Design a protein around this ligand. Sequence first.
Ligand SMILES: [Cl-]
Ligand SMILES: [Cl-]
Ligand SMILES: [Mg+2]
Length: 213
Amino acid sequence: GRQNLYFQGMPKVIIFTDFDGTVTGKSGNETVFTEFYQSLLQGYKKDVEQDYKNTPMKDPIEAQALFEAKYGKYNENFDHDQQDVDFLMSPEAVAFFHEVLKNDDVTVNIVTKNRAEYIKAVFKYQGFSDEEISKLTILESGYKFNDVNSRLNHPTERANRVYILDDSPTDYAEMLRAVKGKGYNEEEIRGYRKNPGEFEWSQYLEDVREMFP
Ligand SMILES: [Cl-]
Ligand SMILES: [Cl-]
Ligand SMILES: [Mg+2]
């Protein structure tokens, strides 16, 4: 306990979460080939698909206009029962990310085969500020083991808790392998492998808030 300075004494949490079908209610391959997703790409032609991952995306303000055209304004009278609302984050997921993206002691990594431009447009449509979105680390190489392994090697501070969330068993298993290969043990890991729509975001919010005063 011998230390020459005061050092901050707060817990640290690291999140590795999938996006499509974990944060949203639709799996990746039920998302990126739809007319709606394809309409966000430059050069879109109705009933034509372009590479979903590498085709340049329309400007953010255009993507926002397309989200609003599809779903209306994400304001207080937003229609949460409308068709295709499963493309979006649930209200429980929205509340979770507002909490963790304002908490400097929580590092939020989204590990995905989707793309940062799309994820940022979803958060933006759903009321997140640029400041909040800038606290996301989006890892989109497509190989989740390498993405988590490389990220946990970064000289960040060691977590008291690591969250792993994924609706795909194979991708979950890769992230879990990477986390255990960086020295974390079972009581440090909170792993959730659920089907889309079945993640208890409000419970994870309560469990994360329990750690901080
Ligand atoms: Cl823009
Ligand atoms: Cl993915
Ligand atoms: Mg998924």
